[PDB]
């Protein structure tokens, strides 16, 4: 079955990608890495979410509109693990890639919440640096930036977490064993899709959301009520 | 208000004649070089150019059979003729330039799309153009 | 009835009657800008009230327990006792999330209150003698009142409160004699310590909510005493007020505004979420967040940690770090605040005793100083605030430090050179409207073509038939004719159809007699005010 | 003698502005009809127009042209200096432009309901693009009904409220012309 | 009949009309004040009051 | 470059150049904007002139 | 006036009595995201503060 996918997954990579990696794989001098030794992950998670085909140097890559479709992602990943492997996707008991299975080590059919402690946990040691508290992202230097994590799903996550696409460092399975990668899922999944307790949100961005519409806004409507209570002369 | 009114039929048959020319051509040549079928690009915008010229001429010339001989359409008029009240003319207004920035700040919100710009953005539009609307009839300072 | 008796049994025990009647009798003047504090001093009720429920159930100890409470997603988690308490607080407790937010928008309310009403005091001119001492006072309470709210957000010991708590530490730490000596003094040892959330807690509880408290007593008993300045108008001068009196038509008023306050805080308290705690986890020293700024008015001395250019001395033995740097210019930005009115008589050369306001177009000095602080301000919270401003609106981290650096050079200067010739074309309007009367607006031809507006006049016109200029004043000039009542409205009556016409008549006709009856009293007034100055 | 009948300047002015804006449809149009040449080969527009419901959009019609009715109604009014006949029919036109929009908003919410978006297909993106632009410019016309109330509820009624009154019922009047372009085009013509 | 509102400029509807979605008696637009004013007035009908007022010294 | 000799020759003209005195300075101006002033009033005509070709 | 006055009097009486009403018998205590009456909970603050 993958013998015959390998072929459209030539095809797919004949077409678009060879001006930045080559024909072989082995890169361009200013234009592209080499994907010898990524495996399927990293060419699953660059093409699903949409990263590749990169149209414009900069400082960095942007998440948009996907150029191909699922089964042709699968098809040019299983082109690239041809030439020398990698990581590999976490697929299910069944064989399809895992999706809402992965959250939380204990996962039945709801979030478990000792799963969404520890994750919690993690996430602010190791991600939230770089994204917020929540994953609403955030800034680097020289026009980068840790980007939302609404936006991923559970294997996206997973093989961002193992490959580390630009400035992301690697959290390799041994470092971050899959209980700890799967609690970290269940974290930003819970953090996503729970309302906030206390009203409209105002992003969660912190302390500069939240001044920003008092300091303009609230105080604005005050004054507006005093020149009505008031005179102007 | 007589001629302008007038003009403004050339331009709008014109559209109009070639709108049906390029409909038909385009529906039957099979020429080399290009591909035969009507295309509705072009087409609708010619039928509907005709149609904005064909209002502005129409209206025109609804409103003009009411009209009087206005001096300035007499070909020999005197400067006394039109010596009265000219009409009401906004001396000056900050409003404009509050509006031009309100719509500049709900564009800035379409472009990184945060909603909360947007949201803003339409309500300091219609704020600004309100305020525009009501300048010359605020209530006098209710003592 | 009995209360004439109650009456009675009072003043023949304490004789008030000569004392109230002259307090119900003070007369305030009415302009919208004169009931921002009241802002403040509402905002300042509901902070110390919505506290007091809070200390109820918050418990200030930096001493851990394992949480087994009503947030699940964070049972088993070891946390400090504060934290624990402020979400048991948030979850346990029937509205107490509602009650913690509410104190928190409180505190932003009330210190951009404080900001509004200072920036009318500065810009009119309110400071001048023999004021002065209300601006010395004011200025120590909008100082005070964020020191407060900056260690009032610490107390719960969260992953957020604790990295400014880590700052202010290593801030301390850093002075070049006794920075060490002051820190182990201020936390008891080093950070963090035991003794450190308890302090913080009465400092936050008692202490500056005491002094807060007593300043603001003497600051309103201040104004009460000298009674409140007034903008210049038709019969108004340096020795007398015009407004409304204290009651009842002004003391039902302040009551209404207290209750548009109150209720808008309550509205905004639950309807958006302000510092979720919950998803923010316990603080320990290794952990930190991109977006990790203080509160909205700390931003300004978060800024201007950003914007240093990393000067540091070495000496030898010793060091004097970079960031002494920002203490310094910070101290000199409160100081140059605090002593501002002499600063102001040794340039503006008077030491006069003023009671009526300026138009801050009128000044344009001082109001183009105000706008350019307001810029530089403005620079260094949004300086504080980059890393989001970076990460939503797409601008490089790198540039947004430069422009912060370079703009609180140039920035500066352009808004005091815009706002000087703002200011001028202004009073300009104003001299070509008292000198020219107002443009109607209505243009007319002439028999020999010329286009014309006729232009209405405000004062007496010679015999040429053009207006005689008016001296200017200071008060506001009309400038169109719909503020003169040209625009008001001929028929009477409510929405779907009107009034009766014998009812219509008669209360057009009474309208119209109180206000030109207004007019008289105004107009001899100031007739009198002539006579009275010769 | 009484003077000259001139033309109304700020009837002129609002009738080239809405001539103007007929262009700006015609964009949207044309958009639509190549969208519907391109589905008309598969035949896939034949299954994803049997997503609409075409009763409700008669009930919506009938809605906004009797809307257009009383706005001439008040105009009516308006000519005569009846203050008061032009704030009652305005309100009632208010009141249908409001009931137009939340019946608009209700299709849409159903047919996310039911299984077209915007992501769906190209027919979800043409439908919705042309309807949501047209939405747009009555709820625009419903806040410049509100705006006029404003004006005539603070300034005595001269002939500068008459005319402001007349304009705003010329840019109702072509809303209500585009919207029977379009629902011919997108219900019946399809 | 219908009500009229006062500031309503008289006519007779027999010999013209006052104005209409196309035509009007002026060039530009009307006046907010009422065409059948005539500006300038005098001072004290104007109902402003010049203020008077000095500063210390 | 080129544009150099302009900017400069605005800015100086603007604030010190040739000050105009006649209605028409280059002399034969057929249309309706030289019969009046340079610059012109704020409403633009002190009288009229019988107009009666282009 | 009297009706303008009373209409904003009775706006507060419901206003208050609404208040009450939520206080007292509104859900209020905490959901996880997979509960049901998360709904309710998510409500609890905004709607007592709202009225
Ligand atoms: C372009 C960039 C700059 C921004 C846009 C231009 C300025 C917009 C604001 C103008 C406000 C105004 O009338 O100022 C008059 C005021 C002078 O007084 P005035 O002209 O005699 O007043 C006549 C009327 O009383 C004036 O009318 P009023 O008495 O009803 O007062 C209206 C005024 C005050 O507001 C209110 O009366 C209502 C309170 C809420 C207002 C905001 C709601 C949202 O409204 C606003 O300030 C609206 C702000 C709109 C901002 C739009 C987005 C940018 O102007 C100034 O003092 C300076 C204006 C600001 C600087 C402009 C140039 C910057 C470079
Ligand atoms: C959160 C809850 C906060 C609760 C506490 C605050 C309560 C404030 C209540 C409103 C108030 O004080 O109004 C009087 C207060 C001052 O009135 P005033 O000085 O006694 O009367 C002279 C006018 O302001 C002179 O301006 P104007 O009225 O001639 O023209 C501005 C126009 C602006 O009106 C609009 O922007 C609305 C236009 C129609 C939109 C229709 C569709 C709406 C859906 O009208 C207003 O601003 C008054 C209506 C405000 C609500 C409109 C919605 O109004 C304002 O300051 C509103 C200005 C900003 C409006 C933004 C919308
Ligand atoms: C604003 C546009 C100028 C700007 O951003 O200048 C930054 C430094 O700020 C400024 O001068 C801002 C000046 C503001 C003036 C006051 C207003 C430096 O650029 P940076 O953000 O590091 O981008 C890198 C390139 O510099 C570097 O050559 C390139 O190789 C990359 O590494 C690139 O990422
Ligand atoms: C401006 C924003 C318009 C609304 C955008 C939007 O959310 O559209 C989708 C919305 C819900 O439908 P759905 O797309 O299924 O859900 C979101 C999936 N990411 O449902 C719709 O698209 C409803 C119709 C929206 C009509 C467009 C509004 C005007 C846009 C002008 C540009
Ligand atoms: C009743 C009213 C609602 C308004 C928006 C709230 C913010 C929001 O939506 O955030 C999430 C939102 C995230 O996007 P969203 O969730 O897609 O809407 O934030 C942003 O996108 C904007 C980020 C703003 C950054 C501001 C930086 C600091 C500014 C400081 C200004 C200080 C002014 C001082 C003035 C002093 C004198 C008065
Ligand atoms: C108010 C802020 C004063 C900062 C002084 C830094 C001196 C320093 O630590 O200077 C040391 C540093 C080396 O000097 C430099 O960078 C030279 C420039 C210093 C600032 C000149 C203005
Ligand atoms: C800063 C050094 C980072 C740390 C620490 C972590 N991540 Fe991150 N992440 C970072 C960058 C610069 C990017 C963008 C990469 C790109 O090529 O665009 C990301 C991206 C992700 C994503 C993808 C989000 C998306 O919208 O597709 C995910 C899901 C993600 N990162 C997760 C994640 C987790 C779980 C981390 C802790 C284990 C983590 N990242 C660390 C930068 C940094
Ligand atoms: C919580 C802090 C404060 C409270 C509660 C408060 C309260 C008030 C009130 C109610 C008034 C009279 C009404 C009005 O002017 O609107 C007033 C006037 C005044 N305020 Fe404040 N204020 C505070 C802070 C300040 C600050 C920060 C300053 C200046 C730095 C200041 C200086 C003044 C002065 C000088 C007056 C009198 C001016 C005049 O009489 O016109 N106050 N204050
Ligand atoms: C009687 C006076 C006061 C008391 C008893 C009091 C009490 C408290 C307590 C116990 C907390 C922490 C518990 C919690 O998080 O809910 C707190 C937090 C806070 N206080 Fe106060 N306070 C008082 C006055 C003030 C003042 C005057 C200000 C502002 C100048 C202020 C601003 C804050 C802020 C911003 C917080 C953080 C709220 C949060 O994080 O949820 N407080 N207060
Ligand atoms: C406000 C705070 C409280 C203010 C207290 C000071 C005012 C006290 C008023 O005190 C009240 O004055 C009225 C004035 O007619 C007296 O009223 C009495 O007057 C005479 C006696 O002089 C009686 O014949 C008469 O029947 C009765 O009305 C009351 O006996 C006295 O009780």
Redesign the interface.
Known sequence: DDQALISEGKDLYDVACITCHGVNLQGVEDRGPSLVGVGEGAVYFQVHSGRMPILRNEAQAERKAPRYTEAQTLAIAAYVAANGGGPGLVYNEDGTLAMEELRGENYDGQITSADVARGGDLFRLNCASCHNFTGRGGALSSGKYAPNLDAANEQEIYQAMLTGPQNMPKFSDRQLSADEKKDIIAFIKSTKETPSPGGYSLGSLGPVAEGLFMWVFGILVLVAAAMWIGSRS | MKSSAKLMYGPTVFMAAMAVIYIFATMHVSDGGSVKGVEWVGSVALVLSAGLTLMLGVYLH??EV??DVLPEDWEEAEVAD?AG?????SPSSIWPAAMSGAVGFLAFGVVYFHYWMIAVGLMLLIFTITKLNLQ??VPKEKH | MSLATVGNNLDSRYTMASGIRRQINKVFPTHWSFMLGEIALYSFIVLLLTGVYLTLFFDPSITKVIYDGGYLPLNGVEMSRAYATALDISFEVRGGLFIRQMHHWAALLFVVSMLVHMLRIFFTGAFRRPREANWIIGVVLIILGMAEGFMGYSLPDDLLSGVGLRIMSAIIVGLPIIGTWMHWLIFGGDFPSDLMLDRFYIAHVLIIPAILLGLIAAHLALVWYQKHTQF???????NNVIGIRIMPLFAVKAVAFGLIVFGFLALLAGVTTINAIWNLGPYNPSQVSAGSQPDVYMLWTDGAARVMPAWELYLGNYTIPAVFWVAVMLGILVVLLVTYPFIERKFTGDD?????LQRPRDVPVRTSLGVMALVFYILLTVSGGNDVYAMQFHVSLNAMTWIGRIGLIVGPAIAYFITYRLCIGLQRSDREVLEH?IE?G??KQMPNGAFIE????????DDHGHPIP?PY???AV?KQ??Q????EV??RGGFF??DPEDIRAKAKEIEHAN??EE?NT??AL?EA??ER?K | V??????????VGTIVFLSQELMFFAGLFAMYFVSRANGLANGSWGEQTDHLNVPYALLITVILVSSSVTCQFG?F?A???????LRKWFLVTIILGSIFVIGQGYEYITLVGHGLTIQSSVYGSAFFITTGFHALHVIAGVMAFVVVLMRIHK??????Q??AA?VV??YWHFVDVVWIGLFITIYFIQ | K????????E?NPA?????????????????????D?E???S??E???????????? | LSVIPFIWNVFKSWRYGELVTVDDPWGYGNSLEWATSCPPPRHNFASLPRIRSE | AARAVTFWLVLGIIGGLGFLATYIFWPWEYKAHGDEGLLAYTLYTPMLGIT
């Open positions: 609804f409103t009411r009209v039109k009240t000219l009409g009401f003319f010359y009839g | 210049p108008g038709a019969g108004r001068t340096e006069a005793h003023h009671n009526l009367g109607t209505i243009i006729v232009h209405q006049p405000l004062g007496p016109v008016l004043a200071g008060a009309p004719m719909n003169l009542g040209y625009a001929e028929t159809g009107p206000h030109i007019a105004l107009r100031n005010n002539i100055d | 009484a003077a000259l009948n001139r033309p109304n300047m700020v009837s105009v009014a000519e005569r200096g009846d203050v008061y006949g300034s005595k009624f001269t002939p500068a008459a005319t007349m019922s010329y | 219908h009500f009229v509102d006062p500031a309503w400029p006519h010999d013209g009309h006052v104005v209409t979605e196309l035509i009007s008696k002026v060039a530009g637009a009307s006046s907010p004040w009422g065409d004013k500006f300038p007035v001072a004290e104007t109902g402003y009051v010049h203020p008077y007022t000095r500063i210390n010294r």
